[model samples]
Target chain A: SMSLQVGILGNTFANPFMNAAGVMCSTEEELAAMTESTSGSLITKSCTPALREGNPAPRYYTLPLGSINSMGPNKGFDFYLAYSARHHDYSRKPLFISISGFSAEENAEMCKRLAPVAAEKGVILELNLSQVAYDFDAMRRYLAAISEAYPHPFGVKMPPYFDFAHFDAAAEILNQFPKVQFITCINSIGNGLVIDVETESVVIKPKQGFGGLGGRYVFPTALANVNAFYRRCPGKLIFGCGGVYTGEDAFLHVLAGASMVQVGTALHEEGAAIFERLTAELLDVMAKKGYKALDEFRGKVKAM
Target chain B: MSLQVGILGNTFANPFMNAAGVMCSTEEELAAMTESTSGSLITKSCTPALREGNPAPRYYTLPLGSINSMGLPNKGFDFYLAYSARHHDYSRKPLFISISGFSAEENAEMCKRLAPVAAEKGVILELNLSCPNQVAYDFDAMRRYLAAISEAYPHPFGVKMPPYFDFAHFDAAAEILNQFPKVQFITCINSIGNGLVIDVETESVVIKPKQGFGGLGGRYVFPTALANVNAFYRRCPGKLIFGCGGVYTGEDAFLHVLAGASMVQVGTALHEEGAAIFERLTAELLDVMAKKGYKALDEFRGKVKAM
Candidate 1:
């Protein structure tokens, strides 16, 4: 039998796979279903302080390569906080609570109140860094302040960066905070416009047909970013997210230095059932490569 | 009968060209492009003074893409200016001159000096705005910078823009660019800047500059490039767009046009394949169009169907 066990922040996971934020955790039922699935762990839907109706309908659409969505933060913090505080079962798998505030103050305040509760309940925290509009320096300062205020082990989910200057700048800032344990590489590639050739209009109804891009279309960019951070920030763990559809994709992410891998559009299209197939596929790939464990080839992508 | 395109009120034999900062760095290379099957050609981005750029091992190729930290090296202004003034044959194909300056003042100065020269020579100008070594221009600064150069240049030109991930940025950048009437076209994407490729066996970085980090091109950036082209094509009705990134085949070229690019530029692929790729691409694109029963590129351009 092939084993998929991996460790992060002193906790062992049965596998290094899970759903990316914004996919299958929008409601309590979805969250429970995810926990019941074979995923090594589960994360809650990213929440704002107040309930947001989200963008208009037709906000999500799938393409041949992947899917696009402009679903603004829909679930509120209280909805998820109350659930995580009362219902999370730590023995089955680790539970991660994702938070995305509309403003830095809201994020700080939410963290201030939730850190203690999360610590007591044994829930991990992930601050979503996608929706914010702050520049690099301001984001760094904000992270520093938030980590100081919370004083708990946590992680930040980041947008993909295209420049080395940004990688250097962001890594420098993150390396300063010892409490920040993990860095999730990439959110959806934001603000892509997919047009309907026949209608001469946009496909998604949100932001007048503009939305975040995900899926196979972003596989290369995702791998690049995952490796970029994994190489840049030696002190932090890297959770790879984006374009993970099969075991080969998962293997590639691990080879590119991602400690954990997350699936988004693929999981959306296939549902939780993809976890089993992915696990099998990953084991098959490992066996074919004459490997018994992930540690054998993890982060070993060779350069020519 | 097929593959002809119109840009800047000029008809091109085809929609294929080389992106600036690739194969057109020297006169020999530019001459090779002129003799090749390409519809048009462009010169390397020039600075006020000659620069040798970063050290050796600055570029590396990969199966998926390529990365480079060339640091914007090129011959000085006078060398390219003299070449453009005397040697270029516009009747064979359109020749675009790319200019990149260290500062806004230098950019304006070069524009002032080169605009009149370009007008005399009937050459197009492409202001390079996405160089990785430079600090990113905020929307306001970009606006002011373009306006100042436009005032002095007084001719139809274009800007090579960096890939922007946010809709707000797309809207904001397009709004500013739309204000400049002289800005005739926009090149969507230079390269996805600052990606790292590693040699885990050595436990060391690959490229020498900036700790093995450089701009990414080829397959990794195709979707982003297409998104930028489509985004601007919808927002800036008056402006044309040039698609750059991941164009190794005719299918990739077809996708760029369908996503609203007037022309498709090859970079890393061109560097790898030399000038012979134009012929291969031309045949490939023509075959695909024939198979689709397409009469012309514009027939179904920018027509991605929503599922």
Candidate 2:
């Protein structure tokens, strides 16, 4: 059998595939299913300081290109943290706990509290940067403080940046701390509107039809961010997420420099079975190209 | 004939075509573009002087998208001016001259010099803000730049913007752009910049210059492109928006117009597919329109309703 060994942070992943934080990780049952599936790793849903019922109904809708959602961080930090602390099997696969707080101070506090537990249990912490709109300076200060507080390798899930200045600025900010081990290129492309033609109104209930876009629509932006951070932050790793529905999409992400790729909308639409399908498809692509390992073609898109 | 669209007080044959940098780089390319079924043709983005652009392997194509770091290569401002002044046939289609300068002062200087020529020759100016591998326009600088150029040129023109992710950015940019009444239209999204593509076998960067980083275009950017287009369309009620990014099919074009783009620009797809793409897009768009029982673009343009 061909191997899909991918090394990251001194650990070798069986395959470079995982479920993105927000999808298939909202509840214990979902997380348990992921742990039992073919995915190389699993991340808890982005949880806040307290529990939330989330936005109103019809908060998520599927489209031909992708899907949009305004779930608004429905679960609480304690729930996911407790679940990871209890059931996370470090021997089977790595587990990541995702945290999204209302403020930087809150997030830092959560990180500080989770650090000791994470160190004891070998769980990775991922700070969600999707909903946080803090400016560069604020983000830098937050990262510095959190790195100092945690004293362990962790990652930040980021939003897609379109400008060169942003790419430069963000990389500079992230470079200030070596403890920042991996950079996840892209959360969903936030604040997009999806319309239902017949209703002549918004498809989602939250934020007046505004929600984050995922799935096929975000593939290019995802690859761009993955490659941007990969090139900019040589010291850090990149976890590629966004617009990965098939084996080809996953292959494209790795080719763009992602050490690991996360599936979101496709996973949401297809369930855990997608991981096996994607793994087989990716292997098929590699086999067809006569490549033996994932690294043989990782980040190898030819120029010209 | 069924694909007619009106923008900035002028009628266009259709809203499907190539973006500035892809096919309109030289005179021969421009002439060939005019012969194509595209509703309009835009010249390659020109700086103050001729540039050879970056070193070889500056562009790469993938199954899903394309990347380029051509570094604003053009035959200089004067060459495009000479071509536009002499050879543009407006009766057939509209001609757009794209200008990229080193600084706001240089951009205004070029605009000032070309304003009279543009007005006399019926050429449209598109101020490109997506270049400069090092420097980028901040919100304040963008405002000052547009204000300076509008003051000097005093002509109806447009600005090409890079994509924006934050809503605050959208509001701030729209505020600056709408302040200038002379700014009649805006093109949403240049390619998402600073993306790196590597060749795994070589373990090196793909492009020679910039360590393999460049602008990303194609299917990956369609959602962001549509988001920017619709965002600006809602924010800037008075100005028209030209959509650029990830348009290879009539379905994509229809999506752009549905998101409120007055015109759609194709880049990587145009580079790969050629000018014949316009016919396919126009037909596909018409087919989509016919299936929905829509006779005109306005019936459903920006009509994506939220549930």
Candidate 3:
């Protein structure tokens, strides 16, 4: 049977999802290993222009379904350069580099500075435009400026807001910036807390009560956003993110209009080997659908 | 207040020694540990005859919990008889014996064998009916066996059930066993079977597989266990019920008793801390009950149903 294998976020063969660049692939060999072993497409963790120390201890908590972490772009462009240097002989899968920065100029400058590496690495770039509780406009400007500077294909990722007014505006802005390759819809919904009533305090800490709710808990919201984006922006390719833990989830995202789906939280509980399960699940979905290829189900909706 | 605490059923066979060795060696140590605590104590899983269990790696560990498949290995009923001969001193808190056997006859015979020891020593016997790793003949046969034991054993007998049980089957079994008032209580429940956890890189099970399944213990099973106990309590309100699962703190223990349990069992957390968990749990239980104006154990038992 023909199968549709997908690399959702960044098929690192480690997380197989969106990893904020830092703690992965210090050398070319590691990057090659990751690229070769991954079954689907690949995305480099969000890389900046300089090296960085990733988040501190207990940064990762293995919840029942997924994980929650606070680690952001901890490393610089040098790591991505080293990784791209290695990608010369990496996996045959399509590669995407996720880029981020504090300002639009820096976002554009980072892309321009790393243009040689991106071209040399033979991979597209992904602009992680926004995260939970961040400046949405600044992110859009960063995406626009980067797409204008790098002529290479790039994608913008955003949050799954209750309404699409902000996203529709962003989509319109990106439509003007045609160089934008795709839009990765939705980051994890912003901070939520599970409190321990007995202790009369939050279970995690004195930190603010909000942390991004990911995992099985946020699947519906993510799916709704993907479907909404697909409805509103039919012309644009949507890279779906948020609460995708299984191959079924990946398939649902595709039906909802995602060209590809990114797994973020599922890796926390399932471990790095989640990709193996996801591939099996994706194959199962394909077999059940009587489809021979990946594109067969792309944008095929069951709901009116 | 009488803070009722007991250990869940686990077959403890020391590697360095046999059943006779355990009887001769650890009897004094168990007695010593029993001396300082006011809570009730339940001995490890015991069967009719001493049986050697499966070899290592019989146990596996993860960040949240542990999986054990110790195949119910135990020294025969006669070994307990010997231990009771010298050390059946129930002068301190009462000791409860948890019996795990293969056949109904073995269970009956073992209960008959231990009944005198229990009566003489002022101890109680809790039938360890739900071992996740061991296969029983059938639920019907098992019920019959428990009935035979309940009839034969002239002491306070309790049957431990699992969380994933058919309430109808449980109610039927309780009704059948209720014929013999000697079977005075029910423990709902033991751990659920060990669900599988795979480590993808190694292509091996993160934990070893057992004949049935390893018992799943931890906060994960707490809600299920609580619901089961509460259900049994609702149906058999007059019947004594012991609740247990994923009890780490004293507050959790109080909640279990409050939910439906006459008393509650503690596990998993004991592995994280040592026996010191008991002291912390006991102190916490006293404080919470005192603050709530719960003057006695019965005062707040099953109070959760009201709220």
Candidate 4:
């Protein structure tokens, strides 16, 4: 196995080229092919309590820097659970399930329903703050409650803004809930559409405007945010995300202090094989650096 | 400024990238790389005839693999003359030409026609047979094709193959290597074909589908390519192999060479980083080479067998 602990950070719907939510419901054949061919461990789309149709149409837009997708946590919990339960074994590699909820109660309830299934499927469960679109308090409470109830080796996915002033509060909450295995720093940065110069109207649909930005464009911003959190949290495990397409990109994230690397948008542009590519690239990097394992420089950055 | 590198396999009737939209008779993207201060320049996938390529949505960008139905789209023998004739100073760096053709007759025809031009242009011609989009290998057409082209083209020729072949295919390819002494080198692999990406919501396939699958590109396909190149170097012994696949950095390029590749080709990373990636890769390779106590590219070529 490659030394790099590769994980699919986003959902199937987080595709950069097409539908944000449409990729998750891929037929079994598609999912199998993807898992079989991908370089990293497969992470299923976030599962919620109920089935959701997701956001309205026009849910994806392409920006020069990166893409913004408004593929809300529309896939209800049961659909993803069933999908995960069936396809979890498709990959011989590690599988992670991103769990999303609309409210604190919903998150806990979903985790309670998911913990056994996740354990049975031999996968790890990650709790994502679904309320960042609405409330931060709800995010903290839900994360804490889910940690208290699920008690599995789960991770937390948060928006970059959580670090704004309320980060201390969020960190305190995470501190209170030590069960959180890792933290996924930085989701998509929401941005609006650019009006077409000729038509004087938004070129893309409104939904695309609401999604997050990923790719090389988000590298600088994402690096800063992730590094800040790494410094603040110290021993906390982090899955650095946002615009990681190459192995060097992953290395930079590691240097900045990410325990694991989560790939979300770059997957849209580079394809699933990016994980293998990243691994191969990382191996090459490690070999050149004279490091035998990823653990050798798990955050051994030069403080220049 | 980072060194910008580009690998141009061959020009055909099909679009290189799914998003590029337009396909030209000649390698239209050649002039685009001249502005790149770094990285070796490559030519388009060239063929003997002006063959029309596969239908629309020939290339699809999927979540895992890239699917392409673009059958070799090339302007044939005559187009290269006019293209080279028009843009005398297209690029500044070493230009590597990629040649692809159907059947031995076609391969020989294109090779002979382009030989004089390649020599005149001071560039190297690569016989790109590793096109996954075309099923030339299944019919055992590649051997005859390579033999005919090598016999006809006096200029140095590099044969390109796919990455996912078993030992049997390698043996067959080895046979070609034994038969074709005139061929200068070989590129280990090409993209895997027919990978699809669908939009589950619309119930429609994204990237518009062509044939059932698309060509698999990107970092995901690197290992298979690297391993194949390494295997060929060990089995064939002596002949050069140009490694191509998911190379995203200098280390990857260096690894490819270390794994018995004479040189490495990168396309997917170019899309993500533009031509500047070549410079970054070259610098990284030089650094690693210097640190490893080697002074030249040949020092580590095929040295992985001992490791």
Candidate 5:
């Protein structure tokens, strides 16, 4: 009896919990496992046009309260296409294809190459926006090109924003494009350092131990960004990410205005089976609170 | 030999200090801080007039952190200056006078009035650039405020900053700051502005302002604090950094110093624990220092190696 279903762009998800693109979907086995798991949908790893080797070893490290990674690589778009042709049965659940190309043209071309499958309406394209989050002109230019290039409904995965001014500015830009249907509030907070007290040195080696931080360390910020955009850009849906490890965390995201929520560090830590645990916990919170549906408290947070 | 720290032409027995907003507000509290174990003390970030800031239930404390939305409740600039005048006669400790002006002129006047006596009393000026409760701050105006305050005071002072996340922001901020030669120090990070804490049980925001959004501090801000400290430390070669935020233990303080802080300031922890927290902070820092086989802070200060 409790419903975890949510709808976006005419597609319905069985639940609002899904794997954040970078985690648990980096390999075929991982992707296959996610397909069978209890998560509402599965997002493939963020890929480039060609399969590229990722960051170096020791590029990822787990902190007591967080995790840091400056890492990547996977089967490229071609490999993803091959898997999609046979492996994906989308009507069972939605599939999100995450991509980032070095240039607008590359991203433009990749979305076009995947257009045939996306035309089937079961696929969502997530355009990575971290590289241009701060460069307003670049973001505007990229959005204009993509909203026209891919035209089909898609979303932009945003980096976390601090300051009400930035939140306002980002939402202003996103509001102008109707084709952009969803927003993933927050990728990992960029460029944080975790130091080991015993060694007195930084953890992770990329960019001299500066890496993107995720998990408990970022939950508040993730909520802040989610609410920030939810209030600012009412035109779009929000997919809350960062710091979500439990059903409570996921529920808080919905309360803050996320239609769907994504898990990162926790998914990596617990494996594919964690999705089941998350759904159970999510249902527990909803049941105890008598929130039979997402709308009961969605964006209803009251402040004094 | 002791935990003495020497930076910006003065020396303190320990690096721990209290900033404007916390236990350093009034004459009695100021006295308490001077008498306490903290190496130094600062005044409230005064506005031009005796402004009663925001409503009650404005502050909330979390288990691992705090969220505060104090609207700069203070007794005006002159009251503190008068307190400072009397404070000079008996106070031999390093004292800081902070001002968060509503305008460039307010900061200029506050600095103008505080001068001569400020110089005579060996006081340091910490111009606050981040007050989470303030109406708003634009980069253009902050530049003007910095320029005007530096000119008004004619002393090498510091700016208490909020955290900057994007490198572009850091680079942009560093550019504006580098132009003013008299600006000698920077405090990396004030509370993260507009952080929300909700009570899942109550289904309401924990705090009572801006729809229950307030500035966040303590462990919640630790990694971001470290990032800002190191970010500015790498950028502002001409200035020193005073690390603030997320220091609950000696290890936290040690990380701040290693990440590049000449002095460390405490707020949420201090607001909750009082001036006595300094004693524990010193003890904890010493414990970390001894195990690392280090004697003084400067030996490894700003020595956090990348990779």
Candidate 6:
């Protein structure tokens, strides 16, 4: 039997595939659905410290190959903590709680609230570093403060990095912190424009829709970012996010050194049932190759 | 039923042309392209000495784009100069002679020879600053190259720009280009450099050289190419922008114009679709113009709306 099981963070998971934060986990019902799927683990949406409405209507639009969204987070942290605080009785799978802050102080405040109680609460923190992704100094400042404040190992969700230097610079900052056990790349390729030539306008209504891009458009760039960090940063895990629609895509991520693969655009389109299809297809490829585990191929992408 | 495009005192029938380093490499290929509907012509980015380029299998194509590392293979400086010398006799169509060099001094040396011939005969000089040991990123080195070339040539010129991904880079590059009035036009984006394509079946790279890493083109770069064009358009005033990358259709070219390109160049698609690709490109552009009820290129060029 081809097992998709993976051992990470001193814990074993049923598989190496899961849903990325901000996708299909925005509600209580959505969280319950993911728990029932074949996904190895589950996570909550990155909620803000306070309640806020996201971007305007038509903030999210689907492209032929991918999707574009400027949709802001709508829920608050307390909305998700309700489930995390009571989850162990219902499921044995790991539940990661994601929280994003609009400012450094907001993040710091959350750090103070969640850092010390993490072990007993059994919660994981994934700081949404989406804003400071372009600003290296701000990113480091956030990393430095969080690594010190947080008592347990946590993860950071990153935006897509385009250049080699950016990858190197980001890895350098993360390498300084040992508590950052995992790094999820990327949080969509930023500022991509998709024009609706039929209407002679942009696709999304996030006001002419200059926003983040996902799906096939991000395949190469995502792989480049995932592997770039994998090569540069050791003693950390990679949560490969973006451009995963099939088993082959997940295999590619693992080959690029991803410890776990996270699906965003695909899951948003295919629903929770897509996890069964993905895991089944991944095993098919593994069986054809006569492999028994994801480790056989993980991080073994032959760079020509 | 025709398009009018001009820059730096040169006019052409349409905005479509072959991107440098594509079909315009040899006299035979150059002549072949001239027979097409393309409005103008540009020589390959010539080096000081001859080069056969990297090696075989240095290119690979995906669905819409391609990856290549030709290593600037060319017929050398003298051959192109000789070709340029006689190019104007049979044709009044404007011709751009592109020059890249291994070193700044050789680039300066080539400028010395071409400057006199370029004063007349409708020849436009394009400084191939992109292939420069990445002079685009090395801002001071880029300044050094431009300073040397402008000193030697002292005439109107333009540059073939490499792709830039960041706002900070766009600001720095535009600030440099703003210093030289001699640079009247700027071509946005060379193929996005050093992209690697792998075959999952073989578990290896597709192209042979550089370990299967090369430049990227075709629809894969449409958004990236558009972003660079508009970024510079917003940054650099008084300079004409020539857009290239991901333009395989009329709508593609239309987006480039909407993003602020004065002209558009075709590379990967042109190679795949052949020299006659210009005819189809211009025809579709005209159709789109009619559909949009626009009579001239200037009516909508660079007029894209932003949030």
Q: Which candidate number maximizes lDDT?
A: 5
The DockQ for candidate 5, computed on C-alphas, is 0.66
Model 3 segments more than 4 A misplaced: A1-304, B1-29, B36-38, B134-138, B165-174, B177-179, B209-213
Regions of model 4 farther than 4 Å from truth:
A1-304, B1-28, B48-52, B60-65, B74-76, B85-91, B134-136, B290-293, B305-307
lDDT of each: 0.82, 0.81, 0.57, 0.57, 0.84, 0.80
Q: Give the TM-score of candidate 4.
A: 0.46
Worst window of 10 by summed lDDT in candidate 1 chain A: A193-202
Writing each residue's lDDT as its tens digit, candidate 1 over A62-162 gives: 98678888887556888888877887677778888899886678888988888777778778899887845237766776787687778788899988877
lDDT of 6: 0.80
lDDT of 1 at B291: 78
The TM-score of the first chain in every model comes to 0.96, 0.96, 0.82, 0.83, 0.97, 0.95
- A250: Cα error in model 3, Å: 12
> Which of candidates 2 and 6 reaches a greater lDDT?
2
Candidate rank order under DockQ: 5, 6, 2, 1, 3, 4
Pull out the clashing pairs in model 6. none
Residues B227-306, model 6: lDDT tens digits: 78888898998899999888999989998998889889999998898988988999899999999888889888888876
DockQ of candidate 3 is 0.02
Residue B226 Cα positional deviation in candidate 3, in Å, after optimal superposition: 0.8
TM-score between model 6 and native? 0.91
Q: Which residues of candidate 5, in runs, are more than 4 Å off?
A: B88-92, B134-138
| A1-304 per-residue lDDT for model 3 (tens digits) | 5755443334332222332222233445544544554435556667767766664443445455444444543446766756566644544565666666767777778778667766666667777655421445665566567767886666677665533344466556667766665677666544433322253232333222223456654454565566666766766677777767777777666766676767666644444466677877877877776767666766565421
Whichever of 1 and 5 has more lDDT, that candidate is: 5
Q: Is the docking of candidate 3 incorrect, acceptable, medium or high quality?
A: incorrect
Q: Return the top candidate by DockQ.
A: 5
Q: How high is the TM-score of chain B in model 5?
A: 0.96
